[PDB]
Scaffold this active site. Structure first.
Site, PDB file in Angstrom:
ATOM      1  N   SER A  74     -13.331  18.961 -13.923  1.00 22.05           N
ATOM      2  CA  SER A  74     -12.839  17.693 -13.398  1.00 22.05           C
ATOM      3  C   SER A  74     -13.863  16.971 -12.553  1.00 22.05           C
ATOM      4  CB  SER A  74     -11.581  17.854 -12.557  1.00 22.05           C
ATOM      5  OG  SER A  74     -10.486  18.177 -13.386  1.00 22.05           O
ATOM      6  N   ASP A 102      -8.140   7.481 -11.632  1.00 22.78           N
ATOM      7  CA  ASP A 102      -8.700   8.745 -11.149  1.00 22.78           C
ATOM      8  C   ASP A 102     -10.220   8.681 -11.011  1.00 22.78           C
ATOM      9  OD1 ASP A 102      -8.897  11.343 -10.213  1.00 22.78           O
ATOM     10  OD2 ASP A 102      -8.456  12.264 -12.173  1.00 22.78           O
ATOM     11  N   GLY A 126     -11.956  22.958 -13.598  1.00 25.45           N
ATOM     12  CA  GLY A 126     -13.260  23.104 -12.987  1.00 25.45           C
ATOM     13  C   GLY A 126     -14.290  22.119 -13.498  1.00 25.45           C
TER      14      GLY A 126
HETATM   15  C1  LIG Z   1      -6.043  25.027 -17.343  1.00 27.51           C
HETATM   16  O1  LIG Z   1      -5.490  24.391 -16.182  1.00 27.51           O
HETATM   17  C2  LIG Z   1      -4.710  23.183 -16.316  1.00 27.51           C
HETATM   18  O2  LIG Z   1      -3.495  23.230 -16.242  1.00 27.51           O
HETATM   19  C3  LIG Z   1      -5.365  21.853 -16.539  1.00 27.51           C
HETATM   20  C4  LIG Z   1      -6.882  21.906 -16.458  1.00 27.51           C
HETATM   21  C5  LIG Z   1      -7.639  20.697 -16.986  1.00 27.51           C
HETATM   22  C6  LIG Z   1      -8.270  19.840 -16.079  1.00 27.51           C
HETATM   23  C7  LIG Z   1      -8.983  18.750 -16.554  1.00 27.51           C
HETATM   24  C8  LIG Z   1      -9.079  18.538 -17.927  1.00 27.51           C
HETATM   25  C9  LIG Z   1      -8.464  19.398 -18.836  1.00 27.51           C
HETATM   26  C10 LIG Z   1      -8.579  19.194 -20.312  1.00 27.51           C
HETATM   27  N1  LIG Z   1      -7.965  19.975 -21.117  1.00 27.51           N
HETATM   28  N2  LIG Z   1      -9.296  18.185 -20.802  1.00 27.51           N
HETATM   29  C11 LIG Z   1      -7.753  20.490 -18.360  1.00 27.51           C
HETATM   30  N3  LIG Z   1      -4.974  20.947 -15.451  1.00 27.51           N
HETATM   31  C12 LIG Z   1      -4.555  19.892 -15.940  1.00 27.51           C
HETATM   32  O3  LIG Z   1      -4.554  19.806 -17.134  1.00 27.51           O
HETATM   33  C13 LIG Z   1      -4.061  18.703 -15.198  1.00 27.51           C
HETATM   34  N4  LIG Z   1      -3.793  18.788 -13.777  1.00 27.51           N
HETATM   35  S1  LIG Z   1      -2.351  18.338 -13.263  1.00 27.51           S
HETATM   36  O4  LIG Z   1      -1.481  19.393 -13.688  1.00 27.51           O
HETATM   37  O5  LIG Z   1      -2.345  18.264 -11.820  1.00 27.51           O
HETATM   38  C14 LIG Z   1      -1.964  16.918 -13.917  1.00 27.51           C
HETATM   39  C15 LIG Z   1      -1.440  16.795 -15.214  1.00 27.51           C
HETATM   40  C16 LIG Z   1      -1.131  15.543 -15.770  1.00 27.51           C
HETATM   41  C17 LIG Z   1      -1.334  14.379 -15.057  1.00 27.51           C
HETATM   42  C18 LIG Z   1      -1.007  13.015 -15.637  1.00 27.51           C
HETATM   43  C19 LIG Z   1      -1.845  14.501 -13.774  1.00 27.51           C
HETATM   44  C20 LIG Z   1      -2.150  15.731 -13.221  1.00 27.51           C
END
Ligand SMILES: COC(=O)[C@H](Cc1cccc(C(=N)N)c1)NC(=O)CNS(=O)(=O)c1ccc(C)cc1
Ligand SMILES: [Ca+2]
Length: 223
Positions: free
Chosen positions: A177, A84, A175
């Site tokens: 990311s 990523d 946000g």
């Molecule tokens: C709150 O909204 C969500 O669901 C989180 C946000 C998020 C984004 C980045 C980091 C964090 C964190 N807590 N450190 C949280 N999205 C996601 O968490 C992920 N997007 S996702 O759902 O598209 C996804 C999930 C899992 C894989 C392997 C790939 C993609």
């Protein structure tokens, strides 16, 4: 960023905001011509915003520069977020100054327990939503893979690491990311994914930048 603090204007001068009419992801300036971000932040029509603190107010140190080219990692997998990482070339070089500055790439990786600074304009709530205007900061350690995997049951690859606090309360969030994880003066992580934000036994997952430095350097040299 959940459980963090207000960084202070331009105290994270490598932090960029990616804008397509609105802030949607972070990024990190790596030289005057290039930004590194997450592949999952890819879209066309990106404007890179450097020198930001309040993303909704022109405060006087901003530089807004359109992307001329984006390069998603050759092996990015959008289902698992393996690899990523994305490079963005600016249409014109940024004017480098104390508030718009590059972050060094690592020559070696960071070990478990190393403390890092994570930053962004993402959601600040673990339940519901609140999006800040000024840049937020969080100190968090790299976790061992074994602790992370046993606590979370996440599937991660060797191109990812976990950082944060298993007890919950402190994490990146939606946000943030694409933004930086800086440890001992080097860009070691890119905010990638997680499960919710700041939940117990669900730490943040970050792209392991040290594994990509050769690709970054050769891509920049050839583009
Ligand atoms: C709150 O909204 C969500 O669901 C989180 C946000 C998020 C984004 C980045 C980091 C964090 C964190 N807590 N450190 C949280 N999205 C996601 O968490 C992920 N997007 S996702 O759902 O598209 C996804 C999930 C899992 C894989 C392997 C790939 C993609
Ligand atoms: Ca601003």
């Amino acid at each position: 960023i959940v459980g963090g603090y207000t960084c202070g204007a331009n105290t994270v001068p490598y932090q960029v905001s990616l804008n397509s009419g609105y802030h949607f992801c972070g990024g990190s300036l790596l030289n005057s011509q290039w930004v590194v971000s997450a592949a999952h932040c890819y879209k066309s029509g990106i404007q890179v915003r450097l020198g930001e603190d309040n993303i909704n107010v022109v405060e006087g140190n901003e530089q807004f520069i359109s992307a001329s080219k984006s390069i998603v990692h050759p092996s990015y997998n959008s289902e698992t977020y393996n690899n990523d990482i994305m490079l963005i070339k600016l249409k014109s070089a940024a004017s480098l100054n104390s508030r718009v500055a590059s972050i060094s790439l690592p020559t070696s990786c960071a070990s478990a327990g190393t403390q890092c600074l994570i930053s962004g304009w993402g959601n600040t709530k673990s339940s519901g939503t609140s999006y800040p205007d000024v840049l937020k900061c969080l100190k968090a350690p790299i976790l061992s893979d074994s602790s992370c995997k046993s606590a979370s049951s996440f599937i991660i690859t060797s191109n990812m690491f976990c950082a944060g606090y298993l007890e919950g309360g402190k994490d990146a969030c939606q946000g943030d990311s694409g933004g930086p994880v800086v440890c001992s003066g080097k860009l070691q992580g890119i905010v990638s994914w997680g499960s919710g934000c700041a939940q117990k036994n669900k730490p943040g997952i970050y792209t392991k930048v040290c594994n990509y430095v050769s690709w970054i350097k050769q891509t920049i040299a050839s583009n």
